[PDB]
Amino acid sequence: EYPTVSEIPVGEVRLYQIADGVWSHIATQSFDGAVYPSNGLIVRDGDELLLIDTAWGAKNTAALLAEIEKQIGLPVTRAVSTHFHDDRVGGVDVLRAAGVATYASPSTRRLAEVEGNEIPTHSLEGLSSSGDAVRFGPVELFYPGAAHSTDNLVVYVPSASVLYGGCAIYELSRTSAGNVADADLAEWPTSIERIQQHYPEAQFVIPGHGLPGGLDLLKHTTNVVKAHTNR
């Protein structure tokens, strides 16, 4: 079963195999004074791996590479960061020193720079307008519009029907919006609806944090966001 925040000391990383050649990676990090889990994705592309998102920090991202080498044994050659916050680009310097080609949208790179976060080297063209989709090896990258952040991307794995929603999709146990300093509350449900309409065949939905589910995580997220908007 899926690794949980209480089972992973900070600094450690677990892998969870969803399908043939598709894994999630799970780490934990302290914010304020709580402990919180975070998901990313790993997708096999021939004899190499595509990493989606760092493991929230340099120390966790170094352990992520160690766990991959220990559990999978294939080289991580590219990585995509789905938005500019530290849970998605923190560790990008680690990835880069290990010879990983790091990528993010121009929006993400610009915002990471403004915010003082690590900046992926390569720019993902063709994702600046809501509804844009591009192919990236074994996945498709989709910009649904502004939601958790103005730059958030989601990732679909066609071969396995896996939708990685990143931090634009909440796990079921999250009933409140939390920190929305950089979210677009007014557009968030509209962006979620673009996800639903573009990936209605998705079978396994991974939130940015916590337990996977199905497409019902999209309506759950809409419910939470709309309830936060209303007070």
Can you give the binding site for ligand ITV, defined by CB under 6 A? 31, 36, 85, 87, 167, 174, 176, 178-179, 208-209
148 catalytic? Reply is: yes
Q: x/- string (CB under 5 A) for Zn ion, residues 30-69?
A: ----------------------------------------
Name the packing angle between helices 188-198 and 216-229 (round to 10°). Answer: 170
- Mapped onto helix, strand or coil, the DSSP state of residue 60 is helix
87 catalytic? Reply is: yes
Q: Which residue's Cβ lies closest to ligand ITV?
A: 178
Polymer length in residues for the chain: 231
The amino acid present at 198, given as its one-letter code, is: H
Do the Cβ atoms of 40 and 62 come closer than 8 Å?
no
25 catalytic? Reply is: no
Rounded to an integer, what distance in angstroms lies between the CA atom of residue 197 and that of residue 200? 6
* Options 53, 86, 148, 152, the catalytic residue: 148
Q: Which is nearer to Zn ion, 138 or 147 (CB)?
A: 147
* Options 60, 85, 86, 152, the catalytic residue: 85
Do the Cβ atoms of 38 and 26 come closer than 8 Å?
yes
179 catalytic? Reply is: yes
Q: How many Cα atoms are found within 13 Å in the side-chain-facing hemisphere of 3?
A: 22
Shortest distance, position 209 Cβ to Zn ion, whole Å = 6
Among the residue ranges 3-11, 18-26, 122-130, 203-211, the one whose residues contact Zn ion (CB under 5 A): 203-211
Shortest distance, position 74 Cβ to Zn ion, whole Å = 26
Rounded to an integer, what distance in angstroms lies between the CA atom of residue 90 and that of residue 60? 9
Joined together, the tokens standing for residue 93 give 């310097």
Helix H segments across the chain? 58-71, 86-89, 92-97, 106-115, 188-198, 216-229
83 catalytic? Reply is: yes
Q: Which listed option, ligand ITV, Zn ion, none, makes contact with residue 129 (CB within 5 to 8 Å by class)?
A: none
Q: Which of 63, 167, 177, 202 binds Zn ion (CB under 5 A)?
A: 167
Is 25 labelled a binding residue?
Answer: no
Size of the site for Zn ion (CB under 5 A): 4
Sign of CA dihedral 157, 84, 169, 186: negative
Q: Which is nearer to Zn ion, 85 or 194 (CB)?
A: 85
Q: Which residues does 167 contact at the CB level (< 8 Å), separation at least 6?
A: 82, 83, 85, 87, 88, 148, 149, 152, 207, 208, 209
Shortest distance, position 166 Cβ to Zn ion, whole Å = 7
Could you tell me which residues are annotated as the binding site?
Answer: 12, 47, 83, 85, 87, 122, 138, 148, 167, 171, 209, 220
Q: Which residues bind Zn ion (CB under 5 A)?
A: 85, 87, 167, 208
Q: Which residues are annotated as a binding site for Mg(2+)?
A: 12, 138, 171
Task: Point out the residues that are catalytic.
Answer: 83, 85, 87, 148, 179
